Write a protein that binds this ligand. Sequence first.
Ligand SMILES: [Mg+2]
Ligand SMILES: [Mg+2]
Ligand SMILES: [Mg+2]
Ligand SMILES: [Mg+2]
Ligand SMILES: [Mg+2]
Ligand SMILES: [Mg+2]
Ligand SMILES: [Mg+2]
Ligand SMILES: [Mg+2]
Ligand SMILES: [Mg+2]
Ligand SMILES: [Mg+2]
Ligand SMILES: [Mg+2]
Ligand SMILES: [Mg+2]
Ligand SMILES: [Mg+2]
Ligand SMILES: [Mg+2]
Ligand SMILES: [Mg+2]
Ligand SMILES: [Mg+2]
Ligand SMILES: [Mg+2]
Ligand SMILES: [Mg+2]
Ligand SMILES: [Mg+2]
Ligand SMILES: [Mg+2]
Ligand SMILES: [Mg+2]
Ligand SMILES: [Mg+2]
Ligand SMILES: [Mg+2]
Ligand SMILES: [Mg+2]
Ligand SMILES: [Mg+2]
Ligand SMILES: [Mg+2]
Ligand SMILES: [Mg+2]
Ligand SMILES: [Mg+2]
Ligand SMILES: [Mg+2]
Ligand SMILES: [Zn+2]
Lengths: 116, 52, 136, 66, 76, 177
Amino acid sequence: DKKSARIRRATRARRKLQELGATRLVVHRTPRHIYAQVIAPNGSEVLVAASTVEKAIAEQLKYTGNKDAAAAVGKAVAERALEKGIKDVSFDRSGFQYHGRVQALADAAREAGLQF
Amino acid sequence: GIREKIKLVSSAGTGHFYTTTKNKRTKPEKLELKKFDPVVRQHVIYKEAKIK
Amino acid sequence: MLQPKRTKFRKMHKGRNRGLAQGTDVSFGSFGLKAVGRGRLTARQIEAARRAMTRAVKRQGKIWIRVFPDKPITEKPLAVRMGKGKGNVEYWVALIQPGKVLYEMDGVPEELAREAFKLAAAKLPIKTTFVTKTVM
Amino acid sequence: MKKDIHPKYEEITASCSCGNVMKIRSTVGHDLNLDVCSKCHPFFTGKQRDVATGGRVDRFNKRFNI
Amino acid sequence: TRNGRDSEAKRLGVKRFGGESVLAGSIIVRQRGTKFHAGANVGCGRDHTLFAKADGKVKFEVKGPKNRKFISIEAE
Amino acid sequence: AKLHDYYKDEVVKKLMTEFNYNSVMQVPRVEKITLNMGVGEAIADKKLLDNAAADLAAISGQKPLITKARKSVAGFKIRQGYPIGCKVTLRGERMWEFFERLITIAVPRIRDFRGLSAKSFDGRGNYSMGVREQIIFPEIDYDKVDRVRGLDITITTTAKSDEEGRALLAAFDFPFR
RNA sequence: AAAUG
RNA sequence: CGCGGGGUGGAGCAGCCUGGUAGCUCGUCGGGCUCAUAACCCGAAGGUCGUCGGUUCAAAUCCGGCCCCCGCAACCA
RNA sequence: CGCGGGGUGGAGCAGCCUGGUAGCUCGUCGGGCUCAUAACCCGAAGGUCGUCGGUUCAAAUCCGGCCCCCGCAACCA
RNA sequence: CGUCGUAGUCCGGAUUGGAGUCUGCAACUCGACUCCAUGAAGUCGGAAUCGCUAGUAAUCGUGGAUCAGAAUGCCACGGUG
RNA sequence: UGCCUGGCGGCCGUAGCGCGGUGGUCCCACCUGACCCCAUGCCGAACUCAGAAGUGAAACGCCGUAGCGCCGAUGGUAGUGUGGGGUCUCCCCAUGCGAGAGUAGGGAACUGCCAGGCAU
RNA sequence: CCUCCUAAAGAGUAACGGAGGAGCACGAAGGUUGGCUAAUCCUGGUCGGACAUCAGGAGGUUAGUGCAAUGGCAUAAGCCAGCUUGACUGCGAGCGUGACGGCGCGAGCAGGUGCGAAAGCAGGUCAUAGUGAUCCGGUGGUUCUGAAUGGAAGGGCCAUC
RNA sequence: CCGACUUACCAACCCGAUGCAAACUGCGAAUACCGGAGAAUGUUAUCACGGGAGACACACGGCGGGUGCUAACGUCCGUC
Ligand SMILES: [Mg+2]
Ligand SMILES: [Mg+2]
Ligand SMILES: [Mg+2]
Ligand SMILES: [Mg+2]
Ligand SMILES: [Mg+2]
Ligand SMILES: [Mg+2]
Ligand SMILES: [Mg+2]
Ligand SMILES: [Mg+2]
Ligand SMILES: [Mg+2]
Ligand SMILES: [Mg+2]
Ligand SMILES: [Mg+2]
Ligand SMILES: [Mg+2]
Ligand SMILES: [Mg+2]
Ligand SMILES: [Mg+2]
Ligand SMILES: [Mg+2]
Ligand SMILES: [Mg+2]
Ligand SMILES: [Mg+2]
Ligand SMILES: [Mg+2]
Ligand SMILES: [Mg+2]
Ligand SMILES: [Mg+2]
Ligand SMILES: [Mg+2]
Ligand SMILES: [Mg+2]
Ligand SMILES: [Mg+2]
Ligand SMILES: [Mg+2]
Ligand SMILES: [Mg+2]
Ligand SMILES: [Mg+2]
Ligand SMILES: [Mg+2]
Ligand SMILES: [Mg+2]
Ligand SMILES: [Mg+2]
Ligand SMILES: [Zn+2]
């Protein structure tokens, strides 16, 4: 019902991205956690992935489902991408409103050096 | 064919004008649109005028 | 006289009447009158046949009319030349292919049913045959 | 909720004939004085007497005595 | 009669079929709706006319949950 | 909020005792209370609708939405998108407060009140009722009002069965029959 | 102004 | 399109005719009067005075654009 | 057979003119007038708009079919 | 003397529900009257039409006959006028 | 490595419904609160943020189960290209192609990449 | 002129063959960003009834598309809201369709713009009707031309009636 | 006033079974058509450009049809 709606919201942009042939940064937010993964244009494989579910990121933070945490995740993924040589991406906000935590993560990524 | 044709003239001072249709009965007020003046090469305001 | 209540279209193309029929078996009744010949039964004809058979069966046992005159046939008025659009719908036909169970009947002895069908048959334009309920 | 579009909503004291004191949030503004409340209302007490079907035989007996 | 009218034929349909090597911009399908959908390296026009966005071979395929005909161009 | 507090400790407990529920989340709760004024007389003149809206606002501390015709019907002489009714949806603390008002004050003020309909539940928990007079609420002043009007209250709950909903309402000392 | 029984 | 003239209570016409100013013919109601419909009087409801802006103390009255009705000649591929 | 026009209470007419609205004259009914009737005066009622379908939210009204009427045209050898 | 202050009202009383009283063998159809409740229509009436010239019209009450009981009718009587 | 969970795909019903059961350490979901970021043509319902007392009730996931959906042969039938024939509105023969429907049956998906939890 | 069928599964294909529409509309009904999902039915609910408005379930696009028909449409092309003029100017590889006149689709490039955080999208509208060649004239722009020369008139070129 | 109820009555929705459709399709051929590769054969048979035309009344037969009466040496298309 809700998840389905979110998927519906997301999919138009996703299709467009696919038809561009873009290496997309896919974010996923839950009330408790935030997930980020850079996915190749083929769609079948991911390059780098960072989340608050990971023990390295979680141990540093106070609470995992907050704006600061999101920012941290964004930075982390971006650094990984840089290391892997992934510079240019497209932000797949995945049905979520570009606002608050998502937005924060994106901005952090931008700050780190991901070109989007 | 109740929709009369009108001539949007540039505020830039150039003789350039676009042309278009407008239903004058439902819309008495003048049409203003920011359109590209190809002579100045800028997006300028184009106020409505009579086709004459 | 059977005729469609409503129609999608008032007139219809001539078409062709080739192939074998689909309503081939005695489904509802015990006995049937299967069309051997190819042709087209009008609504009138069908009605006549029904009248013939009901009387024969003396309002005893059920009759089904498996065919329906759903195709309108146009006739151009007399002394009118060949142009000027399609003629008006005069009568309605069911196109009949060989194998068509036309009528079905139950609640009757077999001989009587046969007799009834024979009576009916003379009213119809196509050559026909008596058939029975078959297991499988 | 939205800042300006809504009517004023503040806690008021709703006095009653019961002696019951009821602090409630309302759009009234001033202090409220009630006639009846849920505890007061004759639902449990009234509705038995309020129907009053009775009987004719008893009435007959009462007034004539034979 | 009230019947003698019919419009000029629009010459629609698939113009370039499967395996047919085309130049970019070549119209693959003229159609009314999206009877065929634009896949990889195929653009959709304003009248839903599918055209090649790259040089290569036409590749018709059935894709997606709605089982729709997608035309892609594969590069040679 | 008092009634919410009551629910939190007592009503839930009562429900558990009665239906023998496995989960505490399995218990019914009142999701929303929806107030509506259908105002057909608004097509003749706009001000009546406004007045109705104001009344609604006075009744329940929220500013009402002005609902519009889903489809045009000639039988009532209305076109699509005609401002025909007004509606308030109450949720949370405000809703609770409204509920408290309704039972502790407003229902008692109903003229010739001999109970509420027990067989009025839609079949899946959600209760509905309607008042003939808006003056039963102490928010509306008797002298100020020009036109007599009413409204429908719709108590929507999480209850799967109507019986459960009924039970819940009883647990909140709802009048019934 | 005003026909008839 | 160019030019001229008009938009006046429910209708048409005066008041424009160089600002200081809502009358005419009916229409409607009510009253008096008649056998009365009427004739006739008295009394009243009924007009961003095409629309808007400007000059000015003061405009329907002057002017400018704009809208509509009419007339005018004019060519009209 | 073709092209038009129509069917609206008892009757004869309107409206249909760009869809939402039922009007006029006579008649009918109840009073009053006269000894009574007529005329006259007052007050009322009365219409699924030939019929059946269609489309707009909605049809007397627009479109189509069918029934009935009224015109016209139904020709050259 | 006080009150109501132009409202469908402290106007108006119809109608209905309940409780009664009396007359009478007997008050269902079908009496009058009382009490409590209830509180229609009606804001001076279309065409038309009636009475009255003085203690008259208008208005206010009172009595009698007929009568077990049962008058806004009838026949009378006075007041104001 | 094995099971479980989350994300992104491929695939597009042998994958979908239905009925029955099941899971909360983690995850996911509902959830608690909202002065603030932001939000409601009213409403913290949704969107959003700050959170973690409670529960898996709903949802979601998993396991089972032929009430359906779905897939589905072989054979036959229809049609039909070419040639030939007849009783020629339709047929038949030779030769090639060969359905649709139905039947036997299958069938409660399969699978890739990354991440987390618990195990060995 | 458009849609369907006739039309024989590419295109096309006739008849006084069978059916229907157009001679527009819209400064938003265009652009974009963000969000949303329909018809109908049942049950409950003041006035309120077969039919307004409010709930909830069933239902699953049977609805919608500014209008005919066909093909499309949930990624919605359907329905809301914010901000706006890309209903841009110059071009245009390459195609499609026409005997031709023509008509149509078009990625990308230059300039300049709008929406979006960004990727991106935007050269009118879901698409297919809504239209008229040439001549002759009318208006605006343009030093292109200018009959001895300077001007001008007239002509041309671009826009447009 | 809510109505109580039966009886050779017509009957929407839904379920089971039966057909029909040029303007129905949850299916779907044969042919045909478009494109690529290979072989033999064919007087280049193909395309382009230029000189010259004629023709634009067709007829019947076969197969697929519209119209007509599944009439016509009828009529109008498609195809050989
Ligand atoms: Mg068949
Ligand atoms: Mg007449
Ligand atoms: Mg009219
Ligand atoms: Mg008389
Ligand atoms: Mg009407
Ligand atoms: Mg009254
Ligand atoms: Mg006496
Ligand atoms: Mg569960
Ligand atoms: Mg086979
Ligand atoms: Mg098969
Ligand atoms: Mg399953
Ligand atoms: Mg074709
Ligand atoms: Mg073909
Ligand atoms: Mg969108
Ligand atoms: Mg749009
Ligand atoms: Mg549109
Ligand atoms: Mg369109
Ligand atoms: Mg000429
Ligand atoms: Mg010179
Ligand atoms: Mg077909
Ligand atoms: Mg010729
Ligand atoms: Mg010829
Ligand atoms: Mg020929
Ligand atoms: Mg033939
Ligand atoms: Mg011969
Ligand atoms: Mg022939
Ligand atoms: Mg011939
Ligand atoms: Mg023929
Ligand atoms: Mg031939
Ligand atoms: Zn109290």
